[PDB]
Each structure stands twice: as C-alpha cells, then as structure tokens.
Amino acid sequence: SPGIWQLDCTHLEGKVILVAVHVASGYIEAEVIPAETGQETAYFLLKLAGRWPVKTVHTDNGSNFTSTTVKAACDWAGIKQEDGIPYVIESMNKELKKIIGQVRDQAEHLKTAVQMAVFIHNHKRKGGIGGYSAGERIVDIIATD
Amino acid sequence: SSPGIWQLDCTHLEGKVILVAVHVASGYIEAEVIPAETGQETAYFLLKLAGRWPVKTVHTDNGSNFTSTTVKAACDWAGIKQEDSMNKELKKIIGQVRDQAEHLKTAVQMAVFIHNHKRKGGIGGYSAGERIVDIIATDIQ
Ligand SMILES: OC[C@H]1O[C@@](CO)(O[C@H]2O[C@H](CO)[C@@H](O)[C@H](O)[C@H]2O)[C@@H](O)[C@@H]1O
Ligand SMILES: Nc1ccc(-n2cccc2)cc1
Numbered sequence: 535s536p537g538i539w540q541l542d543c544t545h546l547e548g549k550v551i552l553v554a555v556h557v558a559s560g561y562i563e564a565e566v567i568p569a570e571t572g573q574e575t576a577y578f579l580l581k582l583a584g585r586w587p588v589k590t591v592h593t594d595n596g597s598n599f600t601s602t603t604v605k606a607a608c609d610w611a612g613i614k615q616e617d618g619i620p621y622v623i624e625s626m627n628k629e630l631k632k633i634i635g636q637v638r639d640q641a642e643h644l645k646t647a648v649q650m651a652v653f654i655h656n657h658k659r660k661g662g663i664g665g666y667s668a669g670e671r672i673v674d675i676i677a678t679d
Numbered sequence: 680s681s682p683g684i685w686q687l688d689c690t691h692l693e694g695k696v697i698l699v700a701v702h703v704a705s706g707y708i709e710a711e712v713i714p715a716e717t718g719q720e721t722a723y724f725l726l727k728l729a730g731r732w733p734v735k736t737v738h739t740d741n742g743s744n745f746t747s748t749t750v751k752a753a754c755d756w757a758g759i760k761q762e763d764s765m766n767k768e769l770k771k772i773i774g775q776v777r778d779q780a781e782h783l784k785t786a787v788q789m790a791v792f793i794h795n796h797k798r799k800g801g802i803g804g805y806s807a808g809e810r811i812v813d814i815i816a817t818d819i820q
C-alpha cells in the first residue's frame with residue numbers, strides 16, 4: 535500500500551490542475567498544466583516517480599492516460615498503471631479548492647495559489663494537537679531504516 | 680547536514696536553464712527545466728519545494744534572481760531563510776540518457792529519477808531517496 539498513488543484533475547478558472555495523492559498519507563503533489571495532454575501527463579508522472587517510490591497509480595481512465603506516451607513513461611519508471619480504479623479523498627479535491635480560496639488574493643496568478651494550497655495541506659496537523667501532518671505521515675510510512 | 684538544509688544551483692544546457700535543489704545531508708535532488716533564470720521561476724520553484732519537504736534554509740549563488748521581491752515574498756510566506764558539485768553527477772547522467780528522450784526536460788527528469796533511486800555501495804547501501812526519508816522520519820522521532 536505505501537507505493538500507491540491516486541491521480542486526478544481539477545479545473546479552476548479555466549485551467550487544469552493535475553493532482554497526485556499518496557493514498558496512505560493524504561500527501562499531495564500538484565501542477566497547473568495548459569491541458570490534459572499525454573505529454574503533460576507523462577512528464578508529471580515521470581517527475582513524481584523520481585521523487586518518491588511509486589509502484590502503482592490509480593487513474594480516472596481519461597483519454598490522457600490512454601496516450602502511448604503515458605504508457606511508455608510508466609514502463610520506463612516501473613509504475614503499474616491501473617485505469618478506472620476508484621477511491622476521505624472525495625472530500626479533498628473539494629478541500630484543495632477551499633484552501634486555494636483562502637490564499638487566492640495573495641497570488642497574482644493561479645499556479646502560485648495552487649502551490650500555496652499544496653503547502654498548507656501537506657503541513658496541516660490532522661487529528662488534534664498530538665496528531666501528524668500528511669508530510670510527516672508519508673515519510674514515516676516510506677522510510678525503511 | 681541538518682534535515683532542513685538545501686542548496687540551489689543553476690546549470691545551463693541547450694539554451695535552457697536547469698534549476699537543481701540538493702538536500703545537503705542525503706544527496707537527494709529536485710530539478711525543473713525553465714525557459715530563463717527569472718525571479719518568477721525561482722520563486723515558483725521554491726514554493727513547490729517547500730510544500731513537498733520541510734525546508735528551513737536554502738543556500739544559493741546570490742545571483743539577481745534570488746533577491747527579487749517575488750522570491751523574498753515567497754520565502755517570507757514559506758518560512759525559508761535564504762543564505763549566500765552534484766550538478767556534475769546530474770549533467771553526467773543527463774549525458775548518458777539524453778538519447779532516450781526527444782526533449783531535454785524529459786532527459787533531465789530521467790536523470791533525477793536515476794540519481795535519486797541509485798543504491799550507493801554494495802548490499803547494505805542506500806539511495807539518496809532512502810536517505811532523505813530516513814533522515815526526516817528520524818527527525819520527527
Ligand atoms: O505550471 C507551469 C509551471 O511549471 C513549471 C514548474 O517549475 O514547469 C513546468 O514544467 C514543464 C517545464 O519544464 C512544463 O511542461 C510543465 O507543464 C510544468 O510543470 C514552471 O516552469 C512553469 O511555469
Ligand atoms: N513528455 C514525456 C514525458 C516522459 C516520456 N518518457 C517516455 C518514456 C520515458 C519517459 C516521454 C515524453
């Protein structure tokens with residue numbers, strides 16, 4: 535389970551946000567991209583896979599994931615691509631947009647607000663003052679020694 | 680050496696700029712390919728990095744991009760203190776795989792992958808990715 539990520543997209547202000555969620559921790563990575571193309575999606579996946587030990591990605595089976603460029607990237611990086619596998623995370627894509635609202639007036643451009651929201655989400659302590667943030671949870675889950 | 684210390688440097692290849700952040704204690708790298716070495720691109724890079732890892736201090740080359748008001752605003756917001764080698768290993772790996780990709784940026788991220796995942800030493804060794812997570816997880820207690 536520690537190598538599983540869920541990908542999804544969010545559209546805001548006529549722009550596309552690609553989001554990767556580490557299922558076990560709730561940690562997120564996101565980028566604003568011009569459109570959901572195979573090349574953009576493949577680049578995103580390649581970046582993510584260089585930064586964390588990514589074994590498996592669950593996707594929404596959008597047409598960007600049927601691109602041969604994305605298939606090639608997943609094969610090169612040793613990612614098992616699992617399309618149409620669903621999976622509180624539902625509450626979270628709604629939650630990123632809420633956080634983006636609380637910082638939007640501090641950023642000239644949307645992409646900056648998106649990275650501010652990612653920062654807030656990842657650093658936020660969950661389950662009270664004795665709890666842990668998504669950033670803390672991911673490193674504790676992944677660390678092997 | 681401390682868990683929150685990164686070093687940031689630029690490398691120029693094929694008319695483009697590669698921004699490289701190294702986590703000093705582990706050797707782990709994050710990199711992006713940018714059109715030009717601008718204040719806006721530098722700030723965006725730093726905000727992304729700080730959202731992903733507990734970044735306390737970044738050591739830089741004190742070029743013009745790092746003292747931009749947008750960079751200072753990003754660093755103030757993210758709680759990053761600015762202060763004034765592995766570019767060589769990265770460039771080398773980029774060389775070794777540049778022929779497996781059309782675009783330079785694809786080859787750069789292939790090189791970041793290879794570098795971060797590569798076990799140093801024999802059986803018993805670690806990769807830079809394993810070292811950074813082990814160091815940070817230990818710091819959490
Ligand atoms: O959101 C656009 C933004 O992303 C950055 C990250 O620093 O880089 C881009 O990465 C590629 C360029 O190297 C793009 O193809 C990709 O869409 C995006 O991740 C910035 O340079 C850019 O402003
Ligand atoms: N844009 C892009 C990203 C990754 C690849 N890739 C394919 C195999 C390995 C990386 C190709 C193109």
Ligand SMILES: Nc1ccc(-n2cccc2)cc1
Nearest residue numbers: 585586587676795796808809
């Ligand atoms: N436990 C573990 C394994 C691989 C990594 N890794 C992350 C990027 C490259 C390797 C991190 C932690």
